[PDB]
RNA sequence: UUUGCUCCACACAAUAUAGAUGGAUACGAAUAAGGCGUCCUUGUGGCGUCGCUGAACCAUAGCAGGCUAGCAACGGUGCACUUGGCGGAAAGGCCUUGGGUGCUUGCUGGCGAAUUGCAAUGUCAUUUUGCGUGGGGAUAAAUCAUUUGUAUACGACUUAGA
RNA sequence: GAACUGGCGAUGCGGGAUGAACCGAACGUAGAGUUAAGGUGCCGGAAUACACGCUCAUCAGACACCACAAAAGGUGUUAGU
């Protein structure tokens, strides 16, 4: 309908500094720094009171003001990632062959190595993205933990690990073997 | 003085024409610095010279002239219509002509 | 024909020996000129009564000028139009300074959104909305807020010359 | 430690914003925004400059950085009084935009003899400036 | 008005720039177009790549070496657009095409000459914001152009050298402006201001 | 090979022009952003200012531009000399040191112009050359024919021969 | 295969790229002006005119005759009952 003006509100906690020139947003919290390029969205950022950032679309259509809320979610995720961080938990599902998951070094890069998936002799390597930490959780059987500041990078590494363990030439609703995201939360517990 | 010009630069664009038939009796001229018919009204009646060079010296010179004059404006963008004593040779499409300031009403 | 004026057209059936002084019917017609206005008058009189141009007469045609042509008004318009597959009734709201300009906007908008040509549109009613809270379309409501103000981002400046030397800006 | 966001301010279409009409019957006169019709239309009034009160497209005008207090839908006498109270014309004339327009018009209004004085005066100033550059 | 007009092709839309250049050349103006790899086409990259593949399939069936030729370089894509807007099969069209030069990057001697823009063909002025557009260099690389990397490297070298030129130019213009301002408010300055200068 | 070839200078003759007639006047990037200036506890920093077109900037007076003395100052701008650099994307251009010399309309001075007859491009540019003049420089090859067979219908190819 | 009328045949000209029949208009030889139908980014003469909207297509669409498209569907988007 081309609304005259639409705005979204971004809350900024006390330990967080957001710098936005043009559309390059950088967020600096206690655990670290994130940077996003939003030059493809065409919005307007305006600080109010050093704890509040408004973002606005002027004379924007339906899809443009959907993208405004999308920008709000992306900046919110940056702030939440530099304050609490993101943690993704994966469980290993298998019926007969235990899936062997290890962190390995090939050449200057860490790789998540998956062995014995359905008794396969193939060895699956998933590169770990920068900022993503890998842990193997104790006191719960067959759970690997993805941890980081960027929900985008953490979730994409989780999805890479889940997608590399898809079953072929079988009925997947019977051969349910895989590595599935079981929990989507923050690093700090509260 | 480094400049001695007493004419306005112009470009011979084409003949008067429809899509597939041209009329060589009328030439279309673009005058430098003219963008509207209102501005082009200034130059109506001004003499135009096309100056060109030949190898053979004719009458004490090797550079020959074709005279004409601005008759009316053409279109919305300052192009004018011109007629010459002999029609311009159509190899001059894109060549430079000189629109003089005489006859002067100013 | 969107150089629209409004005319009052008053006409009647031709007086007869048995019925002198017929009932003097009147219409408000938006049209480009008086000839089209009289045509529209007879078109609507034929379509609502048993009176054709041959058996009647135009008693008066007068152009109606907007009483306050320089104050912003909210207009509610009722139309009936013909689509490709049927007839429909429609209500629209136009914010503008005069009735004729509202009706011009109406014809342009119906052409743009419904491909409805002038032939295919009957303007049932054009009435000023007396006050807010009677406006019902958000595209008019959103311009009626308090202390309205908006920018015009991305200004595009017309260039009179073919080449510019400066790689221009869109600031505004 | 301080959050920073580059504002990227614009001239705003609001009641009381001073516009410069760039094409039409007025074509270079200031007017005031009286009320907003829609996204592309406003009502303007230019009583000081003799611009008729009219509804105009925003593509016919260019907003100036000037603004003055004016109630929505104010009539022509009210606009005149508020324009005089805010001294809009002087604030415009003090701007480099207005002096640029005045200076282009003055250049267009020069005669051939005046252009000759412009040439000689420019040569003299150039001589002194070139001495200053040589000393610098 | 210049004897040669050098057009910075970066940010222009290919067809509108082609139409402008074709009319210029036909009216007898010499044009050099630089940075053809930074031209723009409206529409998404995949759409324009599909269009170029549809171009690529057209060839003389019985001998492909005589069929339509499929030039991959950005400068030759723009030259192809200029043809079709010039009647190239005539002597006048050949003369108008001989008045033209198109380059990737800005080679000498044009690297030390002023570049202009054509605002009626500028994407930033012409395309509605939020509309997708294609970059000619990446499209050319995708359809088989070989020299995008060497052009980018060599353009980076030219840009650093140009930046040094501009820093020197800033110093000189600041000096000139300060000395002009010092010589202002003199008798000649007053009189020139009265005359409009 | 009618004492050949080539390169600078030079006056001559031709030549033929897709079209000179003050100057193609150099950041990069962004455009829901930037340029410039200034300041600092050097940043994605504060502050100010600008744009709304090159309608600008530079240049621009003098028989198509002739003849001359100074004044503050050591400027401006050509021509050869010269010092060093930088530039390989198609560099073939850009910058700079110093002296010599011409002009200077920055200002004040001194003479001339006509009859092209009331206009006539009223000839001022840029190519390619051939003939001379006077200085410098260099002092071969290829093909046919013969020969080979890694080649080959013929041409072509591949070898050899003072 | 019939009816009425207008055409082509027997007819060039401007327009529909192209074409017997469509649109416009019918023709001695020329000059000037104005137009028809059709157009005015470039080819290509003529506004990259002005104005209000709609549409983004990983087979867009783009002018009558005319060089095709349907039933049926879509929280694509826009108006409306």
PDB file of C-alpha atoms in Angstrom, chain D residues 45-132:
ATOM      1  CA  UNK D  45       1.100  29.347  -0.676  1.00  0.00           C
ATOM      2  CA  UNK D  46       3.549  32.069  -1.627  1.00  0.00           C
ATOM      3  CA  UNK D  47       1.789  35.307  -0.714  1.00  0.00           C
ATOM      4  CA  UNK D  48       4.974  37.313  -0.163  1.00  0.00           C
ATOM      5  CA  UNK D  49       6.325  36.306  -3.592  1.00  0.00           C
ATOM      6  CA  UNK D  50       2.881  36.327  -5.208  1.00  0.00           C
ATOM      7  CA  UNK D  51       2.589  32.558  -5.651  1.00  0.00           C
ATOM      8  CA  UNK D  52      -1.122  31.629  -5.784  1.00  0.00           C
ATOM      9  CA  UNK D  53      -2.400  29.273  -3.118  1.00  0.00           C
ATOM     10  CA  UNK D  54      -2.473  25.991  -4.992  1.00  0.00           C
ATOM     11  CA  UNK D  55      -2.100  22.223  -4.865  1.00  0.00           C
ATOM     12  CA  UNK D  56       1.175  21.226  -6.504  1.00  0.00           C
ATOM     13  CA  UNK D  57       3.146  18.059  -7.187  1.00  0.00           C
ATOM     14  CA  UNK D  58       6.323  17.606  -5.159  1.00  0.00           C
ATOM     15  CA  UNK D  59       8.178  17.128  -8.436  1.00  0.00           C
ATOM     16  CA  UNK D  60       7.378  20.737  -9.319  1.00  0.00           C
ATOM     17  CA  UNK D  61       9.232  22.097  -6.264  1.00  0.00           C
ATOM     18  CA  UNK D  62      12.456  21.477  -4.365  1.00  0.00           C
ATOM     19  CA  UNK D  63      12.460  21.677  -0.577  1.00  0.00           C
ATOM     20  CA  UNK D  64      14.813  24.189   0.981  1.00  0.00           C
ATOM     21  CA  UNK D  65      16.470  23.727   4.389  1.00  0.00           C
ATOM     22  CA  UNK D  66      14.292  26.614   5.621  1.00  0.00           C
ATOM     23  CA  UNK D  67      11.382  26.002   8.006  1.00  0.00           C
ATOM     24  CA  UNK D  68       9.050  28.203  10.025  1.00  0.00           C
ATOM     25  CA  UNK D  69       6.177  27.652  12.436  1.00  0.00           C
ATOM     26  CA  UNK D  70       2.834  27.383  10.662  1.00  0.00           C
ATOM     27  CA  UNK D  71      -0.432  25.661  11.637  1.00  0.00           C
ATOM     28  CA  UNK D  72      -1.926  23.069   9.323  1.00  0.00           C
ATOM     29  CA  UNK D  73      -4.208  24.489   6.654  1.00  0.00           C
ATOM     30  CA  UNK D  74      -3.448  28.113   7.512  1.00  0.00           C
ATOM     31  CA  UNK D  75      -5.052  30.684   5.225  1.00  0.00           C
ATOM     32  CA  UNK D  76      -3.154  33.174   3.081  1.00  0.00           C
ATOM     33  CA  UNK D  77      -3.165  36.080   5.540  1.00  0.00           C
ATOM     34  CA  UNK D  78      -1.983  33.773   8.325  1.00  0.00           C
ATOM     35  CA  UNK D  79       0.816  32.468   6.098  1.00  0.00           C
ATOM     36  CA  UNK D  80       1.768  36.064   5.270  1.00  0.00           C
ATOM     37  CA  UNK D  81       1.932  37.035   8.944  1.00  0.00           C
ATOM     38  CA  UNK D  82       3.943  33.952   9.914  1.00  0.00           C
ATOM     39  CA  UNK D  83       6.293  34.402   6.946  1.00  0.00           C
ATOM     40  CA  UNK D  84       6.982  37.990   7.988  1.00  0.00           C
ATOM     41  CA  UNK D  85       7.392  36.990  11.637  1.00  0.00           C
ATOM     42  CA  UNK D  86       9.923  34.282  10.774  1.00  0.00           C
ATOM     43  CA  UNK D  87      11.720  36.524   8.232  1.00  0.00           C
ATOM     44  CA  UNK D  88      11.940  33.715   5.700  1.00  0.00           C
ATOM     45  CA  UNK D  89      13.043  35.860   2.750  1.00  0.00           C
ATOM     46  CA  UNK D  90      16.109  37.207   4.584  1.00  0.00           C
ATOM     47  CA  UNK D  91      17.076  33.742   5.819  1.00  0.00           C
ATOM     48  CA  UNK D  92      16.849  32.526   2.222  1.00  0.00           C
ATOM     49  CA  UNK D  93      18.873  35.453   0.869  1.00  0.00           C
ATOM     50  CA  UNK D  94      21.588  34.717   3.433  1.00  0.00           C
ATOM     51  CA  UNK D  95      22.082  31.223   1.980  1.00  0.00           C
ATOM     52  CA  UNK D  96      24.703  30.266  -0.591  1.00  0.00           C
ATOM     53  CA  UNK D  97      21.969  28.662  -2.716  1.00  0.00           C
ATOM     54  CA  UNK D  98      20.208  32.007  -3.136  1.00  0.00           C
ATOM     55  CA  UNK D  99      23.452  33.855  -3.798  1.00  0.00           C
ATOM     56  CA  UNK D 100      24.297  31.207  -6.404  1.00  0.00           C
ATOM     57  CA  UNK D 101      20.996  31.904  -8.181  1.00  0.00           C
ATOM     58  CA  UNK D 102      21.548  35.658  -7.917  1.00  0.00           C
ATOM     59  CA  UNK D 103      25.111  35.326  -9.200  1.00  0.00           C
ATOM     60  CA  UNK D 104      24.116  33.237 -12.219  1.00  0.00           C
ATOM     61  CA  UNK D 105      21.395  35.770 -13.059  1.00  0.00           C
ATOM     62  CA  UNK D 106      23.837  38.679 -12.680  1.00  0.00           C
ATOM     63  CA  UNK D 107      26.278  36.913 -15.003  1.00  0.00           C
ATOM     64  CA  UNK D 108      23.479  36.427 -17.515  1.00  0.00           C
ATOM     65  CA  UNK D 109      22.571  40.110 -17.190  1.00  0.00           C
ATOM     66  CA  UNK D 110      26.087  41.381 -17.890  1.00  0.00           C
ATOM     67  CA  UNK D 111      26.679  43.328 -21.099  1.00  0.00           C
ATOM     68  CA  UNK D 112      29.619  42.945 -23.477  1.00  0.00           C
ATOM     69  CA  UNK D 113      31.348  46.028 -22.054  1.00  0.00           C
ATOM     70  CA  UNK D 114      30.867  44.683 -18.526  1.00  0.00           C
ATOM     71  CA  UNK D 115      32.375  41.375 -19.633  1.00  0.00           C
ATOM     72  CA  UNK D 116      35.394  43.353 -20.826  1.00  0.00           C
ATOM     73  CA  UNK D 117      35.808  44.891 -17.368  1.00  0.00           C
ATOM     74  CA  UNK D 118      35.410  41.400 -15.924  1.00  0.00           C
ATOM     75  CA  UNK D 119      38.321  40.221 -18.077  1.00  0.00           C
ATOM     76  CA  UNK D 120      40.668  43.057 -17.111  1.00  0.00           C
ATOM     77  CA  UNK D 121      39.779  42.883 -13.409  1.00  0.00           C
ATOM     78  CA  UNK D 122      40.301  39.118 -13.438  1.00  0.00           C
ATOM     79  CA  UNK D 123      43.741  39.626 -14.987  1.00  0.00           C
ATOM     80  CA  UNK D 124      44.694  42.091 -12.236  1.00  0.00           C
ATOM     81  CA  UNK D 125      43.444  39.853  -9.423  1.00  0.00           C
ATOM     82  CA  UNK D 126      45.210  36.921 -11.087  1.00  0.00           C
ATOM     83  CA  UNK D 127      48.483  38.863 -11.064  1.00  0.00           C
ATOM     84  CA  UNK D 128      48.220  39.529  -7.329  1.00  0.00           C
ATOM     85  CA  UNK D 129      47.090  35.958  -6.592  1.00  0.00           C
ATOM     86  CA  UNK D 130      50.008  34.522  -8.561  1.00  0.00           C
ATOM     87  CA  UNK D 131      52.382  36.645  -6.493  1.00  0.00           C
ATOM     88  CA  UNK D 132      50.774  35.229  -3.350  1.00  0.00           C
TER      89      UNK D 132
END
